[PDB]
Design a protein around this motif. Structure first.
Motif, short mmCIF file in Angstrom:
data_model
loop_
_atom_site.label_atom_id
_atom_site.label_comp_id
_atom_site.label_asym_id
_atom_site.label_seq_id
_atom_site.Cartn_x
_atom_site.Cartn_y
_atom_site.Cartn_z
N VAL A 194 0.88 -0.85 -0.38
CA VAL A 194 -0.09 -0.15 -0.18
C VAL A 194 0.80 1.02 0.03
CG1 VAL A 194 -1.98 1.34 1.25
CG2 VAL A 194 -2.07 -1.24 0.83
N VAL A 195 1.79 1.32 0.98
CA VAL A 195 2.42 2.52 1.05
C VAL A 195 3.43 2.90 -0.59
CG1 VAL A 195 4.99 3.36 1.79
CG2 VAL A 195 3.22 1.99 3.40
N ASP A 196 3.59 1.46 -0.85
CA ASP A 196 4.23 2.14 -2.09
C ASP A 196 3.70 2.18 -3.46
OD1 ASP A 196 7.27 1.63 -1.32
OD2 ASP A 196 6.85 -0.91 -1.05
N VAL A 197 2.15 2.07 -3.63
CA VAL A 197 2.35 2.19 -4.75
C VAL A 197 1.50 3.97 -4.16
CG1 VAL A 197 -0.42 2.41 -3.85
CG2 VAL A 197 -0.70 1.49 -6.41
N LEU A 198 1.47 4.43 -3.20
CA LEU A 198 0.99 5.54 -2.84
C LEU A 198 1.53 7.35 -3.67
CD1 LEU A 198 0.48 5.83 0.85
CD2 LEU A 198 -0.86 5.75 -0.20
N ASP A 199 2.68 6.91 -3.98
CA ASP A 199 3.46 8.06 -5.12
C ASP A 199 2.24 8.78 -5.86
OD1 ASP A 199 5.10 9.01 -3.46
OD2 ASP A 199 7.26 7.46 -4.49
N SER A 200 1.93 7.15 -6.37
CA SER A 200 1.00 7.14 -8.07
C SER A 200 -0.22 8.18 -7.35
CB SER A 200 1.03 5.81 -8.35
OG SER A 200 0.24 5.27 -7.50
N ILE A 201 -0.99 7.61 -6.45
CA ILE A 201 -1.98 8.47 -6.17
C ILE A 201 -2.12 9.99 -5.38
CG2 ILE A 201 -3.03 6.05 -6.57
CD1 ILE A 201 -3.09 6.41 -3.27
N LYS A 202 -1.00 10.64 -5.35
CA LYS A 202 -0.86 11.74 -3.92
C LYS A 202 -2.02 12.54 -4.43
CE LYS A 202 2.42 15.40 -3.27
NZ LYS A 202 4.05 15.39 -3.84
N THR A 203 -2.91 12.38 -5.04
CA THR A 203 -3.28 14.24 -4.90
C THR A 203 -4.74 13.49 -5.46
OG1 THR A 203 -2.97 14.69 -8.13
CG2 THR A 203 -2.06 15.99 -5.91
N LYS A 204 -5.90 14.01 -5.08
CA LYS A 204 -6.92 13.86 -5.17
C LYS A 204 -7.93 13.33 -6.59
CE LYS A 204 -10.33 17.80 -4.93
NZ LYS A 204 -10.15 19.20 -4.44
N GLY A 205 -8.60 12.63 -6.53
CA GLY A 205 -8.94 11.90 -8.24
C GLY A 205 -8.14 10.97 -8.62
N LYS A 206 -6.81 10.67 -8.36
CA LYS A 206 -5.71 9.97 -8.78
C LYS A 206 -6.35 8.47 -8.44
CE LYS A 206 -2.33 10.47 -10.70
NZ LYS A 206 -0.88 10.65 -10.76
N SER A 207 -6.40 7.67 -9.41
CA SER A 207 -6.57 5.89 -8.64
C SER A 207 -5.67 5.24 -9.62
CB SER A 207 -7.53 5.45 -9.23
OG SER A 207 -7.70 5.86 -10.70
N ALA A 208 -5.06 4.03 -8.88
CA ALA A 208 -4.32 3.07 -9.18
C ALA A 208 -4.31 1.79 -9.46
CB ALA A 208 -2.45 3.30 -8.80
N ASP A 209 -4.90 0.49 -10.40
CA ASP A 209 -4.53 -0.66 -10.33
C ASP A 209 -3.88 -0.88 -9.15
OD1 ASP A 209 -5.59 -0.71 -12.46
OD2 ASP A 209 -4.37 -1.19 -13.64
N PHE A 210 -4.57 -2.23 -8.27
CA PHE A 210 -4.15 -2.54 -6.50
C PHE A 210 -5.01 -3.99 -6.67
CE2 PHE A 210 -3.21 -1.94 -2.21
CZ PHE A 210 -1.47 -2.25 -2.60
N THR A 211 -4.51 -5.03 -7.88
CA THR A 211 -5.08 -6.33 -7.81
C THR A 211 -4.30 -6.81 -6.80
OG1 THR A 211 -3.51 -6.43 -9.97
CG2 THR A 211 -5.99 -6.49 -9.98
N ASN A 212 -4.63 -8.48 -5.96
CA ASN A 212 -3.77 -9.16 -5.68
C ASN A 212 -3.45 -8.61 -3.91
OD1 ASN A 212 -2.96 -9.25 -8.95
ND2 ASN A 212 -4.21 -11.42 -7.91
N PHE A 213 -4.07 -7.42 -3.92
CA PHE A 213 -3.59 -7.27 -2.12
C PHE A 213 -4.63 -7.86 -1.65
CE2 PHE A 213 -4.30 -5.05 2.10
CZ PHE A 213 -2.61 -4.87 2.13
#
Ligand code: 7Q1
Ligand code: ZN
Length: 256
Positions: free
Chosen positions: A155-174
């Protein structure tokens, strides 16, 4: 609505009058007054088939979302009647390690609090469930700063890719099993969503045992932004509602 001086928790009641209602959350858990309820059934956290899909910065927190189109990851037992399906989890946290949780324990604030949100399948979908007094079950887990939680690092390591409001990223298999402490001892009481719309639809189940996360892990939560891309930077910190009046409620313990 937000968490600032001009739009924070003390303002919410103007748009959402239930903010001053009879079963608002969070609350302070007075551990000496909470009473063992020998009758509560065992709690059942069944996350083996949990299917995460996406992580979203919604301007208030970040949500890890699940596929809730089938009974995969469910919460049963304890105070609950029936089956509650996991839909998302998120955290609330502070600007400093001495604050951040929503619930408190004998007035102690933890550095953060994890909320695993589940809806009662008897109501068919989440939007219908939030209109019912027993529509949701939120499993709340305290975070203290100490050793790292290995299960949190993805979780921590993906936060750089969703820094700002409205950003999302694929996060499967967690696997959310990696966020749970050893013990399922808990306190439970009837309450509400802790953000607008503040609906009084939640059975709260708050685990007594915190998880430990590292200072480096929580510092990365604190690099997120409340603002959208290209807007003046407002660090996403102190996104917690303070404790609300207990009113006509009893907090029950699962343990002696
Ligand atoms: O306990 C809660 N944390 C929140 O962010 C709030 C909530 C709002 C909306 C959906 C699900 C939960 O209620
Ligand atoms: Zn929450």
């Amino acid at each position: 609505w937000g968490y600032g001086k001009h739009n924070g928790p003390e303002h919410w009641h103007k748009d959402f009058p239930i903010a001053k209602g009879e079963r608002q959350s969070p609350v302070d858990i007075d551990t000496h007054t909470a009473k063992y309820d020998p009758s509560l059934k065992p709690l059942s956290v069944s996350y083996d088939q949990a299917t995460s899909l996406r992580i979203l910065n919604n301007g208030h927190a970040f949500n890890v979302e699940f596929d809730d189109s089938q009974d995969k990851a469910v919460l049963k037992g304890g105070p609950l009647d029936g089956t509650y399906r996991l839909i998302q989890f998120h955290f609330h946290w502070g600007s400093l390690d001495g604050q951040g949780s929503e619930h408190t324990v004998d007035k102690k604030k933890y550095a953060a609090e994890l909320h695993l949100v589940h809806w009662n399948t008897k109501y068919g979908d989440f939007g219908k469930a939030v209109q019912q007094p027993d529509g949701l079950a939120v499993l709340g887990i305290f975070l203290k700063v100490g050793s790292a939680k290995p299960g949190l690092q993805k979780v921590v390591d993906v936060l750089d890719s969703i820094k700002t409001k409205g950003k999302s990223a694929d996060f499967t298999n967690f696997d959310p099993r990696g966020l749970l402490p050893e013990s399922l001892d808990y306190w439970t009481y009837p309450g509400s969503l802790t953000t607008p719309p503040l609906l009084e639809c939640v059975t709260w189940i708050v685990l007594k045992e915190p998880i430990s996360v590292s200072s480096e892990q929580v510092l990365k939560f604190r690099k997120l932004n409340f603002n959208g891309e290209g807007e003046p930077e407002e660090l996403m910190v102190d996104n917690w509602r303070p404790a609300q009046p207990l009113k006509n409620r009893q907090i029950k313990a699962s343990f002696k």
